[PDB]
Write a protein that binds this ligand. Structure first.
Ligand SMILES: CCCCCCCCCCCCCC(=O)SCCNC(=O)CCNC(=O)[C@H](O)C(C)(C)COP(=O)(O)OP(=O)(O)OC[C@H]1O[C@@H](n2cnc3c(N)ncnc32)[C@H](O)[C@@H]1OP(=O)(O)O
Ligand SMILES: CNCc1cccc(CN2CCOCC2)c1
Length: 411
């Protein structure tokens, strides 16, 4: 039973989702004028706050809330520690709407108690390929194609309630207020991801991890040692040897991305992403924002051949607080971001990603099995993790799809 989610325009069960054959909205059609102009009511001791996510001090406030209260693993060994610079990057893409960043503060002392963020994204979210085939068979192709045009929607992230305020039904109030503010800007769908199972995902993928600093990963109990290593006189020396990487990239003409690369990177990325059922559409400004290198935040390299960009990869940094081990403060993780290969096999491109991340002091490389991430798991010694990432839409019926049909990376 879901006292809140049962009231929302989402499919309610897996059985319902199994029956969906066309992409389209769930809710009654509404207009901006129908939506309350006033913020959703909240208790008198609380106030709504719209942070300025280009004021250093407001970013710092959000940073502290998330550092102390955001997502942990299931054993509460690690907690995400997104940096202030990362938050500015993630929250302020081109044409972001400041009003979509929603906070709750205690009115008396302005202590930040809760947060949710929305940013604009242009998303292809029309009926998936396998369902369009069925629609053709049945003479229903017009209906199946109705919502094929890329849609300007909201991407929700960073929902967080302070630990001291948990289980008090604040999350539904945050979600309702974010929904109101987005609806007041004539936007009616959202996309979001979560580790937890909610009604009702359109896709779900396992996490994968590639050890870069295995001695540290084992120390902090991120990683275990296969029982088979006990056949060796020295399990750990063998483990280090297993995960060893070259000191320098192998692809000649790999270099960091620069601003003049933007249009070529846009073209090769967009050509690649268009093959997936669900995926973002990026302008030059959005390619520049999401992919140009930013120290400590995002790292992007291109393969240039004959003065042409033919391949690229990107990764972003999210460290996590190591909660229970006093020997290390942080786990330094690199996450596979967008990429495109046209000249070399993907495993050869992504090896250089691992090389660069290792050289820069990263402990592990993480990803979900979206895109063609499965195509280099075995060659590059990624192992499946405990975690999954579930993909959701708000106010959008969508047939179930494999995670290898999803091309949207979520930070
Ligand atoms: C058109 C525009 C639309 C815009 C909005 C689109 C929708 C966006 C939706 C948000 C996408 C976020 C994407 C991310 O950021 S995923 C990351 C979520 N954040 C964390 O996990 C951080 C650590 N945890 C917390 O801060 C709290 O435990 C949270 C805030 C998660 C819940 O707070 P609390 O534990 O104090 O509980 P409550 O009593 O206040 O509320 C209980 C209700 O909340 C439902 N719940 C629990 N977890 C989630 C979850 N991750 N997404 C959606 N709903 C969730 C739960 O089923 C229950 O509803 P119901 O079962 O009774 O029905
Ligand atoms: C994509 N945005 C970050 C994210 C948010 C919520 C949940 C997750 C995935 N969890 C992490 C903890 O270990 C279990 C899996 C990731």
């Amino acid at each position: 039973a879901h006292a809140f989610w049962s009231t929302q325009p989402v499919p309610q069960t897996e059985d319902e989702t199994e029956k969906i054959v066309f992409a389209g909205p769930m809710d009654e059609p509404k207009t901006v004028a129908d939506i309350p102009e006033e913020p959703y009511p909240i208790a008198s001791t609380f106030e709504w706050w719209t942070p300025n996510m280009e004021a250093a001090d407001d970013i710092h406030a959000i940073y502290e809330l998330l550092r102390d209260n955001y997502v942990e693993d299931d054993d509460s060994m690690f907690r995400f520690n997104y940096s202030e610079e990362f938050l500015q990057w993630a929250l302020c893409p081109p044409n972001y709407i400041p009003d979509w960043h929603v906070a709750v503060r205690r009115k008396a002392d302005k202590k930040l108690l809760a947060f949710i963020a929305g940013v604009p994204v242009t998303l292809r979210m029309g009926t998936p390929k396998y369902m369009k085939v069925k629609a053709q068979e049945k003479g229903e192709g017009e209906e199946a194609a109705k919502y094929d045009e890329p849609r300007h929607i909201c991407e929700i992230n960073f929902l967080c309630v302070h630990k001291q305020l948990r289980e008090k039904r604040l999350a539904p109030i945050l979600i309702k207020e974010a929904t109101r503010r987005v609806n007041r800007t004539n936007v009616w769908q959202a996309v979001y991801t979560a580790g937890v199972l909610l009604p009702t995902p359109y896709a779900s993928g396992q996490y994968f991890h590639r050890s870069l600093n295995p001695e540290k990963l084992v120390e902090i109990r991120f990683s275990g040692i296969p029982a088979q290593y006990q056949k060796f006189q020295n399990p750990m020396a063998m483990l280090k040897r297993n995960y060893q990487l070259p000191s320098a990239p192998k692809n000649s003409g790999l270099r960091e991305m620069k601003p003049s690369d933007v249009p070529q990177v846009r073209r090769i990325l967009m050509n690649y992403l268009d093959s997936f059922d669900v995926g973002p559409v990026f302008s030059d400004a959005e390619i520049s924002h999401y992919l140009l290198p930013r120290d400590g935040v995002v790292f992007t390299y291109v393969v240039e051949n004959d003065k042409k960009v033919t391949d690229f990869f990107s990764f972003y940094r999210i460290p996590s607080t190591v909660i229970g081990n006093s020997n290390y403060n942080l786990l330094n993780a690199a996450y596979v971001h967008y990429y495109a290969a046209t000249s070399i096999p993907l495993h050869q491109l992504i090896l250089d990603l691992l090389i660069v991340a290792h050289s820069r002091g990263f402990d592990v490389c993480n990803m979900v099995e979206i895109l063609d991430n499965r195509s280099f798991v075995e060659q590059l010694k990624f192992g499946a993790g405990d975690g999954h990432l579930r993909y959701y839409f708000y106010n959008w019926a969508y047939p179930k799809i494999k995670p290898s049909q999803v091309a949207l990376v979520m930070l």
